């Protein structure tokens, strides 16, 4: 269940190439990998058809959500010699699995980030929004120390709907219960851990009607898609703070502006937005504005305009503790592959 | 009783009425008092004659009084000062004593507000919410150096366990932290949560996060200094939502740069006189240079520093308490009831 | 000569800068001068009770209701620290015996140099650079700028300010062209050609609007004329928001048809400009929220200043001294002209 | 040049520090001339020099390392030519290149208009408080205080140094309508023909509303601006420096800023730029940022009347074109065995 011991010499002969190695990937990943693998190539640019020829000679490609593997790039990784792709994340969506089947490449993945990391990020948003912390930081940096219109709100007895009670939502429910909020939950299947905290399960319509704060933790499924829309928003409680760290597909962004301007939605925290492909995990600040105009998302940039909206760039999973897990699971995954163990993260 | 008809005839003026003071306060006051004068500018000698017919002056922290303004406020006729805050410190009770002017005030903010704000600072710093917000607004959606930290199993020292420290201890335990406390007197609501009381030195040595809730006393002045900081745990997040006097600000720069203090949240800074509760951006820079605080401005420069402008008390709920305590304060004064607030 | 000194003046909308430039010179003349921080409406007009002259600004509105309360308050004169009388009615003033005076021109170098400052800031991405550097991003991408030296610049409108804009731009080294119904001989003596608007729109790298707002000029820049411009054009409007049809800006920004935009003015400034909306709760800000304006501020190649083109030591001085002379002339029964 | 183009095309070129702007201005032109061109995003090290294996010419920038040790590894990689996409050779070791057979070529001049227009840019922005204005408008503060600006038309402007760049600064500023005065050890006949008088340094400092530094950094010009000379200036003076950080003693700035002696400061440059400029430090954890933290620079950025750009005065479409075409011509001449002339050597 641990060490190698010297089967590690075999693991060490594995040659790993890692795409999209940005500063944080260097910080958490590069160090642990070179302790195990003798040869590891860290490529800063993402993975495409032009940087896939970079992988010639390597056995395994380490990838992230922003890296592309569709049918064209899988063919040149297979011809490069890499027979395993390991994701440092749990998203496999952007990889083509039908292409991997033809080319013999096996893909392994990290199914779980540490659930406290994500749950605590949702809670961070609530606190920031309640206390208008981003507003105040900026004003104070400019040298505006006046109090208007920074007046905030107490969380202590507020009613909190937790939508979806899986691993992360459970953590959200625990934390929000501990802050002292009155917590309610909705899920298709009740979580006994949540019930044992004394948080009642109610129907979704009831949860939307009674909540000061609603936090989305459910997965994105056809049944959950645009859970928040023009209709369900009119069912919520006027002034509601809506938090989403799960999936952008859970919210229909078009409906948000009217709801915000009517005061129907009083506040919005988001770690996610419905179309993030090409948008997130990119610093667009580095491109000339004429080039930024090519992929420009106007309704997103408009959304960012509101003082009661707060958006982070998909950092809810991004934590020392979560990265450590991602790293050790990616490495255990490399080893299981090379040592012929059953993978299970495939 | 219809003593409210006696109460209603009370004439009230409030200084330093900014937008937020209008919102929470003016509405509730005119429900009670028939004649109510709201002055946007603060309290001085030149705006004390604005108080010439009124019975009671409602005041704030950044306002005065001097020993002397009690007199033309007195000759204005106001024998009562009603504070919308808990500081009477900046007014002298010795000048008011001579002029028959009585001092009343709101001694308590709802302590969850203050405690929850300290928790807000901790969360914001852990997750780089201010860095993240600004980048996202510019169109930088990249991840480096937004990497945060989990709070769940971290060790948190609460320094001072009075009303606000109690809520802070309570909240941080509910979140899952390992909470320790220091105070002269253990708070039994805190001991009943199974939070151990340890020595200040032990608490500084073990804490990942230290949050100061003690009052400013000679014993606690510059509690945090060059010496005590070296007693702490490398990388510590220090939070001060109480009094600027608890920290020796000069000592922060070396400690931030060595990594000894890993992050700092502040709702208070030691010299707030003339600094806080003013929007300095409305002044030409040459006028700003006159009161410029160089070490405060340097301090804002660090990415791991987060400073709010004394907003920890500032909440719907807390403003409500203040309002209703202030209105009860006016009423008790008028009806010759005992004040209890002074 | 000591008769003028006896004048009693109230000034509405006194913010900090109004204090700095104005109150000092005024109290050198008039013995009693009342400065009210809040603007002019119905309710703060009774503050003018007894005063003979009220000095006002653009954010102050005087319709029939606020005019009646000052009139019975006693003020027979309104003096503007600005050139707009638009928000006041002159027909109500006719009925209540109150006369309208104003400062009709700011120092045109101030206004023109501001248009030039906008061009320079956008060319060199100064706002981007400032903020990044404040954050500690000292990297070079995507701060790459543009030279102004040989660029083609259209000046639309040749009056006192456009003249200065033309002069400055020629001195910078640009190839300057102009459109106006009346050629300005000062502009022609600089060897700047007057051409038709279509020709100017087709050839300009930088187009800067200096014409007044007239029925002929309204939405001068619109969906159709924009397609007549040169792809990548930098558009500057320091005159009037009505000269531009704002709705049309977004597709054109996004198509690259307009490459950059500076604005000191926007078509709907009513209730919007000269207010710091950040002192309000967001639930209150949502009431006057201008979504297309907030969207517009979103673009990296857009730069908007809050109607500061006139706001200058020199221009504030002119405004002050013309205001003091307007008051004096009224009191002395001289012909106004303002 | 047809056959010479095929011979030039056979050149193998590697470029270090290829960030977005280098891809934009450089890569396109290079791939039209050289058949094989390698663009590496990280800067040059001892470790990234091993990337140059097989390559003929390394294209480098001011931020790239050639100290005595990396020249050793580039030599053995096979590169005989180093082309700087810049005019600074300060960081390359020419004593090491001499020993290892490596020749260094360079771009000695950017368009002097680009730089001169940048200083003028700073002047306008500060005069009109454009950075303050932009930020407030973005937050939704549309109020006028303390944004009040100043007219440039009749102001007295000292230009210090009248070379290619100072000459342009003088031309532009006279054109704006300023009364321009100049100082140089040697008068520039083009400046005199603009009708701009030459005065002593003390005379210019005493009379100027605006001082703009364009002289090179010399033992005579070292800390030209210091505690003493600053008290000779005119109270409220705006100081602009786009030339060299060494011209100003940064310690002296704070007292003068706070006393009002220096009324405003625009800078494209600062005294120790090494490891500081051309890096985005926001990509690092704050704890790593604390290692090189420059307390006095960060403090300087705190002032409302100070404006700092990150060495962008040369950074222009037009200037980069000069740089690209001169660099490609530098390569071609080398390949075609022509006399170089942009060669720096020891
Ligand atoms: N850092 C980030 O922003 C990031 C990255 C990747 C994933 N995520 C999010 O984390 C989520 C996983 O959270 P988890 O750990 O708690 O997973 P989980 O499996 O443990 O919990 C999911 C729960 O949702 C419930 N559910 C199923 N259908 C539903 C419906 N129609 N309505 C409501 N609830 C329903 C399930 O019963 C289950 O209890 C992902 O789905 C994704 O949303 C976030
Ligand atoms: N919005 C703001 O930022 C704001 C405004 C006003 C006041 N405050 C701060 O909040 C404080 C009040 O908090 P509170 O309501 O809980 O008051 P409190 O009286 O209930 O708590 C004070 C506790 O500190 C203890 N104490 C006394 N001497 C001590 C020592 N040497 N060391 C350690 N502990 C000691 C006391 O026994 C007491 O239990 C104020 O003193 C002020 O510092 C903040
Ligand atoms: N600080 C500010 O931002 C601010 C404040 C108030 C007014 N303004 C603007 O400044 C302007 C005043 O500038 P000015 O001193 O140069 O005015 P001006 O009267 O002296 O010149 C206006 C010129 O526009 C010309 N013109 C008339 N119809 C035209 C048309 N259809 N097309 C093109 N040109 C036409 C006129 O012939 C005239 O020569 C105001 O009209 C206003 O737009 C700016
Ligand atoms: N993007 C940037 O910010 C950037 C990049 C590279 C270089 N630069 C600057 O541009 C400079 C080159 O400018 P240039 O093209 O005009 O070269 P230049 O030779 O034509 O200008 C320098 C002038 O200063 C004069 N001079 C010499 N000693 C002097 C003294 N003691 N005092 C005053 N003046 C003196 C020289 O005679 C010369 O005329 C570089 O030295 C550098 O400072 C800026």
Residue numbers in the entry:
A (entry chain D): 22 to 367
B (entry chain C): 26 to 367
C (entry chain B): 29 to 366
D (entry chain A): 25 to 370
Task: Please give sentences taken from the publication describing this entry.
To examine the enzymatic function of Cre07.g324550, a C-terminal His-tagged derivative was expressed in Escherichia coli using a codon-optimized synthetic gene. As the gene product was predicted by ChloroP to be targeted to the chloroplast, the putative transit peptide of 44 residues was removed and only residues 45–421 were expressed. The 40 kDa His-tagged derivative was expressed as a soluble protein that could be isolated by Ni2+ affinity chromatography. The mass of the native species was determined to be approximately 200 kDa by size-exclusion chromatography, indicating the formation of an oligomer. Blue native (BN) gels indicated that the Cr-LDH1 holoenzyme had an apparent mass of >200 kDa, suggesting the formation of a larger complex in vivo. His-tagged recombinant Cr-LDH1 was crystallized and its structure determined by X-ray crystallography. There were eight copies of the monomer in the asymmetric unit, corresponding to two tetramers, as predicted by PISA. NAD+ molecules added during crystallization were observed in the active site of each monomer close to the conserved His378, Arg311 and Glu340 residues noted previously. Interestingly, recombinant His-tagged Cr-LDH1 also showed glyoxylate reductase activity, albeit with a lower catalytic efficiency, indicating a more wide-ranging role in metabolism than just the reduction of pyruvate. No activity was detected using NADPH or NADP+ (data not shown).
